Design a protein around this ligand. Structure first.
Ligand SMILES: [Mg+2]
Ligand SMILES: [Mg+2]
Ligand SMILES: [Mg+2]
Ligand SMILES: [Mg+2]
Ligand SMILES: [Mg+2]
Ligand SMILES: [Mg+2]
Ligand SMILES: [Mg+2]
Ligand SMILES: [Mg+2]
Ligand SMILES: [Mg+2]
Ligand SMILES: [Mg+2]
Ligand SMILES: [Mg+2]
Ligand SMILES: [Mg+2]
Ligand SMILES: [Mg+2]
Ligand SMILES: [Mg+2]
Ligand SMILES: [Mg+2]
Ligand SMILES: [Mg+2]
Ligand SMILES: [Mg+2]
Ligand SMILES: [Mg+2]
Ligand SMILES: [Mg+2]
Ligand SMILES: [Mg+2]
Ligand SMILES: [Mg+2]
Ligand SMILES: [Mg+2]
Lengths: 203, 98, 175, 205
RNA sequence: CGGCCCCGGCGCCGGGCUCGGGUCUUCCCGGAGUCGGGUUGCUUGGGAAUGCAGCCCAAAGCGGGUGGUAAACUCCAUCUA
RNA sequence: CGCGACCUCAGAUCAGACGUGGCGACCCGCUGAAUUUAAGCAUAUUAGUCAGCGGAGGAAAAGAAACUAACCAGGAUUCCCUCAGUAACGGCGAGUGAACAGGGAAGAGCCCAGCGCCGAAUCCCCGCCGCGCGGGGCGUGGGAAAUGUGGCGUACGGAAG
């Protein structure tokens, strides 16, 4: 149909016809609040390929985050430690801006479940994202068997644990020789497994 | 004479499988419909700034400089070769015609 | 304009999509008249316009649409920018109109992006062909000029009045 | 710290290890739980054998173990197709299917399809009513047995070609040698260099 | 071991959905500010930089990733993010 | 001037429904030192631990390869024995340190966006009608959601006609 056309058009987001739209939308989002409700997704194909369906119970939020690395909260830039830990200025957060956006959205709305998110616009001082939320207690979602997994209490606050697509990347999961950090589960699980002394009964 | 563990032809001798390869290996092939939609969106969007700069460089006999510029813009050299080929093709397709 | 658009609307008012009330009515009557008359196809397929950007695109790609009408009140323009070039490549007549709700009312929905005319009655074929010519000479034949035309770039009246004062004072000094 | 003479030691006890020590004091209880779970599963699935899904013939990848053969996960789609049964029905029949595995050798393909045919010939299933075909009037009095142990139809016990004894031929005294392996290694090492030399020689001509 | 009370399944009497397998002919077949590159931090046993992140540059469809030493030419094996 | 439709939006003690907090032995995400060792100390070790913050469940995470190997290849993930105190990292000093095999416990696989066809055959709500114990779902009619895209048929192991 047309979603392939929209995808191949959004792929080349450096041409003039797309750059003008991105700049206008960034300017428009700069005047709104840091967190608000978009009544319809700006990227319908991107929302569909993430799991958004045009039916009751699915909400779209637009949220902006501050672009740039994080700074140490130490007073006056003093850490009172060895010189290796004197890095107050140039530090980078382990999680992505998209992930912290999903986290802020899920924290603002606890009654909803963060499914996924995507990028809409950005500039020098801000970066904008659109997140998708599911209502786990709506009858139009609880009755559909394909979306009953979002209702179970195990998926409560998926954004605060890195279960989303943005947090899964920052977690470091994967299969291969490049992901020996976290073999099973988390890197902390791998650490606990590889740094425990196995004392059998007969040794 | 005898199969050896080392040499130009090592290992236990077996017969090859003439079975058809799996269809996942066939991915992102040049499709008529995909080529059509890509060429239709290309003429709508135009070109990128660096693409236009590289086309201007190709218009002049300076080609190694354009190759270096593309290699500095995009990541690797093998991508730069294909980008240079595509830019030369789009420059020679319609601009050479009346 | 306000004349040809109203004419196209009066033409489309005859091929409107069939509502749910009369749809249930005809589905209830079909199972009855099938057992009554014992016929295979007692009702000829009625020619109706197709709604939806995906349907319109799949029709124009296969060259099954006689005409395409597009709305311009869409908020994301990217869902529509690709359509005029596609219709120009396929050779079908495409026309843009004002009001997605006005386009929408015929389809019994709040918002409708595009509408494709595919099948027309024998007695409306002439009325349709009389307007496809004026649509082609307005949009299809002028596609190169539309693609080369650059709009916008208009300053405010408060900034035009001052430059007018300056150019007047400069012309009065030159001659 | 060191002594007169002894092996230098680097014990990895510099970390805080005493707060994470796994003692296997629950090993008998774990074994009892596993045995009870196995018994309960076998009792619930009694007509089907333990480790029900038949597993194919699988050769070890590495050169260290490629001389022996072992069990595997599932039969390949090519093997299923040569056997002639549908892909999705094998799961409920009791045949484990591995769609990721490929087939590179007909020597293993024939062995796998023969194992599948043997399993199918030995298999006897129960119907809902006698209206289902591919069965008999009496099911061999519960098939003479309900559950099997350590492999559904047959383990992966290794077999070996005999090649008992033979008369030495004439040229076997000077057939192979250590010089043969040395020449093979030298050719494998200097294959491309000779090709480049021949190329640059033909260039001058 | 017996007798008494409560709860859960296995077989049987109304109600609503309901074409699989093979050959041949024709068509379709894909996730983007994402991969990757430069750079700066944290981390890893991962070393011409294993992974993550901030900024910039930012694509292709005989394509892309990986093949443990950076780079060019060619071939091969595996996978489809 | 007015009317109507769409679209970005505001208010209610509107009808119905949901989250807050606590425990936190186990688990997930972030950043998080120093005492100590290095017979001194900056790199390093302590440690990607303690402390701090955010969440859930009886388990959680992981999980169907953008995998491992380079020969007769294997085949989700999880845990145990070995690999191995090894390859490797380190003022190559102190010290740190995996992975692939292989044998075992268990072994369940799939869906969707897209590409196309099906007159939107889809879903929520309201009310009377025919049903069962402790009360919720099946058949009927209008009010909304939805053509900027419901649902069956489809998932790379090919699929459709
Ligand atoms: Mg809504
Ligand atoms: Mg202090
Ligand atoms: Mg999960
Ligand atoms: Mg001892
Ligand atoms: Mg390929
Ligand atoms: Mg002493
Ligand atoms: Mg490549
Ligand atoms: Mg390749
Ligand atoms: Mg190589
Ligand atoms: Mg190399
Ligand atoms: Mg001391
Ligand atoms: Mg001191
Ligand atoms: Mg200590
Ligand atoms: Mg450390
Ligand atoms: Mg703690
Ligand atoms: Mg809580
Ligand atoms: Mg609880
Ligand atoms: Mg897959
Ligand atoms: Mg040892
Ligand atoms: Mg280091
Ligand atoms: Mg040491
Ligand atoms: Mg360490």
């Amino acid at each position: 149909g047309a979603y392939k056309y929209i995808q191949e058009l959004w792929r080349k987001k450096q041409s003039d016809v797309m750059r003008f739209l991105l700049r206008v939308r960034c300017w428009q989002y700069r005047q709104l609040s840091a967190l608000h409700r978009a009544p319809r997704p700006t990227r319908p194909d991107k929302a569909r390929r993430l799991g958004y369906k045009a039916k009751q119970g699915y909400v779209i939020y637009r949220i902006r985050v501050r672009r740039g690395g994080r700074k140490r909260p130490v007073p006056k830039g003093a850490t009172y430690g060895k010189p290796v830990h004197h890095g107050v200025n140039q530090l980078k957060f382990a999680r992505s801006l998209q992930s912290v956006a999903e986290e802020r959205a899920g924290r603002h709305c606890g009654a909803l479940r963060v499914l996924n998110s995507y990028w809409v616009g950005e500039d020098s001082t801000y970066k904008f994202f659109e997140v998708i939320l599911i209502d786990p207690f709506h009858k139009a979602i609880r009755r559909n068997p394909d979306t009953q997994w979002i209702t179970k209490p195990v998926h409560k606050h998926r954004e605060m644990r890195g279960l989303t697509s943005a947090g899964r990347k920052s977690r470091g999961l994967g299969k291969g020789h490049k992901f020996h950090h976290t073999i099973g589960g988390s890197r902390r699980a791998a650490w606990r497994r590889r740094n425990t002394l196995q004392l059998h009964r007969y040794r | 004479r005898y199969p050896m563990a080392v040499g130009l032809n090592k290992g236990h001798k077996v017969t090859k499988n003439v079975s058809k390869p799996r269809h996942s290996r066939r991915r992102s092939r040049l499709t008529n419909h995909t080529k059509f939609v890509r060429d239709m969106i290309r003429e709508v969007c135009g070109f990128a700034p660096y693409e236009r700069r590289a086309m201007e460089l190709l218009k002049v006999s300076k080609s190694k400089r354009a190759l270096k510029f593309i290699k500095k813009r995009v990541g690797t050299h093998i991508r730069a070769k294909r980008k240079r080929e595509e830019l030369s093709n789009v420059l020679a397709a319609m601009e050479e015609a009346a | 304009d306000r004349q040809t658009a109203t004419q196209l609307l009066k033409l489309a008012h005859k091929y409107r999509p069939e509502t749910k009330q009369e749809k249930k009515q005809r589905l209830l009557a079909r199972a009855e008249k099938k057992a009554a008359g014992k016929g295979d196809v007692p009702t000829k397929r009625p020619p109706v316009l197709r709604a939806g950007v995906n349907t319109v695109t799949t029709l124009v790609e296969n060259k099954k649409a006689q005409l395409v009408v597009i709305a311009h009140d869409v908020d994301p323009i990217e869902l529509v920018v690709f359509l005029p070039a596609l219709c120009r490549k396929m050779g079908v007549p495409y026309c843009i109109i004002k009001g997605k709700a006005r386009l929408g009312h015929l389809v019994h929905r709040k918002t409708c992006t595009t509408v494709a005319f595919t099948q027309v009655n024998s007695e409306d074929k002439g009325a349709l062909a009389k307007l496809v010519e004026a649509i082609r000479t307005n949009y299809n034949d002028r596609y190169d000029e539309i693609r080369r035309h650059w709009g916008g770039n208009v300053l405010g009246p408060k900034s035009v009045a001052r430059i007018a004062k300056l150019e007047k004072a400069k012309a009065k000094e030159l001659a | 710290a060191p002594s007169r003479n002894g092996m230098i030691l680097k014990p990895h006890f510099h970390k805080d290890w005493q707060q994470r020590v796994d003692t296997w004091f629950n090993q008998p209880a774990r074994k009892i739980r596993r045995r009870k779970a196995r018994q309960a599963k076998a009792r619930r699935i009694a007509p089907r054998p333990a480790s029900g899904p038949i597993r194919p013939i699988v050769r070890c990848p590495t050169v260290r173990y490629h001389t022996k053969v072992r069990a595997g996960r599932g039969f390949s789609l090519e093997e299923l197709r040569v056997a002639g049964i549908h892909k999705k029905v094998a799961r409920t029949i009791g045949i484990s299917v591995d769609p990721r595995r490929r087939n590179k050798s007909t020597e293993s393909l024939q062995a796998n399809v023969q194992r599948l045919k043997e399993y199918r010939s030995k298999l006897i299933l129960f119907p809902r009513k006698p209206s289902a075909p591919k069965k008999g009037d009496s099911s061999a009095e519960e098939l003479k047995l309900a559950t099997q142990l350590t492999g559904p139809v047959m383990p992966i016990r290794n077999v070996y070609k005999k090649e008992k004894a033979r008369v030495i031929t004439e040229e076997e005294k000077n057939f192979k040698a250590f010089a043969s392996l040395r020449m093979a290694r030298a050719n494998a090492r200097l294959f491309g260099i000779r090709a480049k030399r021949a190329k640059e020689a033909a260039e001058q001509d």
